[PDB]
Symmetry: D3
């Protein structure tokens, strides 16, 4: 049968739950996971990149901050079509990776969050026309998923009519972009991905912590302050730079070690 | 909603209207425009290349000759889908680029920006089928034309293929003729056809495209006295290019490295 | 008119019928055919690679063994759409190449066909070895394509392959992986019906299974030779054994025909 | 006149003194500094790489911890030959970079530390034979230079009598390498570069903080605890991974920005 | 015996004497000459690049203007050591290349092959020290001169640096002046100096190198009436080039991929 | 202390002694050995390449035929300087690699690891000077020999150049003969000469190296009855290779990507 043309961009929010796991997790990502992944999807993924997270900002834990990276794929077909389950060579995946990322405790873990989006942002809510000449961005990418029982339309209205205006009003915030998560692909619990730019960590904190104190706590709140969602389960985020050297289909040359 | 699979090749005809602008325009193209462009479309454009124009031949101005280059994209989806208007980072674009290229006069008339979408494969192979790269170096004259307002498109097509092309077919100096209809429906381009017409060199191009074409009758809709009978830069644009470019940008770009 | 999105993987079985032709054939492949091919399809082929064949194993001739390579493309559109026949620059392809590959006879007083099999990009049947990773070790990957002869009912052949042949693969502890797909016959009229890939540790393991263990099979009535694969070499069966890795991943790795000093 | 074949490895310890400067500094490094540098030295530098620093460990400030990266060059000729001062295009270097790196203070500035070494380590003090298969390393590279007035042979004797034995005895320490800094190139105040590997940050701390508490404080000490040297002036360091994606002569493709 | 470490930059001034030869010469350069070259010297040349020439300016013929490109190598060893004469595979070099470049006539006295070795770093920085790429696009005019037979080299030098270079220094149109003595010991090159002189554009180049130079007295050894006073293509060669080239051949070449 | 500039080319003759070891040896070479190697020497090796051997020809076993590949490095400094013994990360090297290559027997005699350093340029060009790539595909037979213990080296050299090479020159099937003395001082290699001898193909190689060589007298030091008269794999090693390899590892390696 036919395979549907389904161009999409996906994001995976990759945490590292203890600094002692960092070297191990980073090695696996760069020495093992890169070549396994390219080997599988080179013919139908047009871009595969990792954006290392900036250092976790103050209170970043409450936003499900990914302390390793964002992993980004651009797909031409849906990775969730059942026919794609078959692979000649499966990924090398030690169970410890799940420990390093916090999906399982060492002995509740946090879920694996893999959000599919259209390739192009659906809503441009502040900063249209910004160029790279306008300067370096502190790009805070956040995904959120309303808790069970919350009407999605109610959640949407709160996001766009209460949360976003506070971003728009902040001079520290230079860009706001948003898309709905393509829930139909893989059952992701997330509903929205937003990306919110600042000049710097102090700007992020001023807006996302201080200015947000002005919001009323919703009745579905899972924590007392914005984002009001359970970290790592109903909100994940990362702050990243404009540029990454890990544009892996173009730039990988094997795991070359320092002398 | 779905995005349509729409594989296309497009061409942009990039002029440089004064030699004094060449260094600035070329810098912008190679230092600024490449990375901005790659940054936007890497996931859905499979090839992005520039083909620098050979030196303008005698009387090339009458053919809307692009004195900088042809820019070529191969798309998997239509760049004019309105959902593609949203971009995280917009292109860095000094207004002077438009002066350098002739879209706006410097401080009588502007020339339009000509961006023609085509199928990835030529629709008509009218001379030279089977020529390979071992047969020799080509002077590849790519020309796009658009008939003026009021001219019936089927009449112009008929003229093109029954009066103009037979002259190319008869000339031993012309080694290849290829043609496609412009996909009008993507972006409202005024052009109707893109042709590519190969010669051995500039002198061959001239013998055929200037001297042999003198035998044509001037059409009633002509906007200049001689072939192509179309208003330069508005209803005809062109460039002569080589078979090869070093600027295959998605594969070969390594940043703006400067000569020592 | 529209062009249909048709993601596929294709394999070409490239033989070299005398060692005296190897240098010339290899030169043409790497010096002439690579750049000609990339020049045509770069915008709509996402991967273009060559997998050199391991040395032909004992009795490999009976399996239509490709002594040069497998050539692999991953396509986004069908190469057989008639609109794709038109090319600005055609590829340089002398009839000598067909001699070297065994498609035509070498000098004036039967050829083997050109086998170009189109497949979905993902294997349709995963029959043994599911979950095998690269960490499990080096594979001797035996890729084979078969086509039942004229007048053999295709469902009958399928059933023989999957109910009589594959169980022998399953029982051999030497065989670490069996994958299969149906050939997309509709694209180009290819006479092959199935492509299988069957992994071993090494040549000895291949031989043990594909020669010794297969002696247990009854000879089919349609058989074109006495022993498995029971099909006419190069015409109804072609194969190659290849490694997990190739350096000739041509759209990423090619830098021109640089010669040794 | 002739140019001398002078193969060397150099290290620059690049700090980022406030998180607010991180996006700006990182942009300048990857957008501006890479192409300017490649443009000058491509013909006589065989490797040019950046190794981003792991997160600053507890008490890392006392070790002159570089919070951006180590910058590494491999040279075929001495960059300090006066003939090399002439360049067709000079680098684009705003003064603000000096503020971001702490060369210009927000009390006193920190010096620009640029140490030249032989390409090969001079002393293999622990872990000879270790391969990449043995696992991920937390590579702590530290340069030290003894205070003015201190005899270099005295400093050396202290280092070898008192410090090296502790590193060798600790099970947490899997590798120790050292080289003398080439003084004669650029007047660098540093005297040694050491590289000391651990499994992780916790192992680093146990050895470099807890085990070192047994040392007596030398008479020339500029701080109370090991390394006993003035942070950023007489000691600089960074912990890095085995691999970097920023192998710039091979891997750079211009400043491609995230979508 | 040992090989001497001899880091050097060389420049070859490549002309194209008729536009009709341009497709053939360009093809040989990019299709045949690149891979033969890389094949021979990859282990001991750290950079190999082509800088295509900007359009020949008015009166550029009098400066031995290279209508194709500058070819630039960075060597770790001297290519003229007799031990390097032995090569497994010799380059493919049709006699027609000598015609296209003007070393011999087609069927026009021949012009010599000018291959100038230099140190990797400019020896004299005479104007514009500290200029960065941020300061703007440069029209980089690279010129090599060799004084005629019989002329004392010290006298030539003093004229160059006390009469010629002060006119460049005085001109606000000239943003950069760099110079090196040619390493004549390597290959017997007839040239004595390479200079690179930057302007904003062709108009600036003309104002300085034609108009401002009219103030110079004609020397007694002059081979033509106006500056540079030297026989074009024999005692003076040059090219105007951009800051950047896409043809950084050891990094950027991917074979001779042809346009569709 | 100083490091001496010592540009050299080295060859390692890599055997695979049983076809059952091929997939394992090949994997180690490409998956494990390439990155460990590049990690160590990127800053002072300018080229690192593998040339896979063609199929062993009839009687090739008598020539110490390397059934895997030639490994080729171009060095800027001597890898055997004792300062280079120290390495941050040592290469991953399982004992089995020695079994696969025949250095140690699996359970009849081991063969030595042959690693021959040479100057970057061939010292002697004895046939076929001027041959270009346009002249056609070559079957390049690279052979190293070392005279047995007790044979005076000058006597061996005399035999090689006065008796063996003339047979190569007499054969029209032999299109090239190149030779260098092995730099024995670097690492104690027991080999004395590396030759490269080209043919059209295997049948040409056989005609010359087996049939034509029957005319030679057997030397008193012979270790086997026929040419090369030297103990296979101990005093002669060789491989036949193509002109091109895709395994130019410093430029072409992108990690161990596995077939789908
Ligand atoms: Cl922690
Ligand atoms: Cl919930
Ligand atoms: Cl709370
Ligand atoms: Cl009109
Ligand atoms: Cl109409
Ligand atoms: Cl007119
Ligand atoms: Cl049949
Ligand atoms: Cl039979
Ligand atoms: Cl801070
Ligand atoms: Cl203190
Ligand atoms: Cl002309
Ligand atoms: Cl003269
Ligand atoms: Cl005159
Ligand atoms: Cl012996
Ligand atoms: Cl014998």
């Amino acid at each position: 049968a036919d395979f549907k043309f389904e161009p999409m961009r996906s994001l995976i929010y990759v945490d590292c739950v203890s600094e002692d796991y960092r070297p191990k997790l980073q090695r696996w990502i760069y020495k093992v996971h890169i070549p396994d992944s390219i080997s599988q999807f080179e013919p139908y993924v047009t871009k595969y990149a990792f954006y290392p997270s900036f250092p976790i900002p103050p209170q970043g834990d409450r936003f499900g901050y990914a302390r390793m990276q964002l992993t980004e794929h651009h797909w031409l077909v849906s990775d969730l079509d059942p026919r794609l389950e078959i692979k000649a060579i499966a990924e090398t995946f030690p169970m410890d990776v799940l420990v390093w990322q916090g999906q399982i405790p060492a002995a509740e873990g946090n879920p694996f969050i893999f959000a599919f989006l259209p390739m192009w942002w659906e809503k441009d809510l502040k900063g249209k026309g910004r160029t790279i000449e306008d300067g370096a961005n502190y790009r805070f990418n956040m995904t959120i998923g309303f808790p069970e029982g919350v009407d999605k339309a109610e959640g949407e209205k709160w996001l766009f009519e209460k949360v976003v205006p506070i971003l728009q009003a902040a001079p520290e915030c230079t860009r706001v972009l948003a898309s709905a998560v393509k829930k139909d692909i893989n059952g992701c619990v997330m509903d929205w991905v937003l990306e919110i730019w600042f000049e710097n960590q102090s700007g992020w904190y001023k807006v996302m912590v201080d200015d947000m104190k002005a919001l009323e706590k919703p009745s579905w709140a899972q924590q007392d302050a914005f984002p009001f969602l359970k970290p790592y389960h109903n909100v994940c985020s990362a702050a990243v730079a404009d540029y990454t050297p890990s544009n892996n289909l173009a730039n990988y040359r094997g795991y070359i070690t320092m002398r």
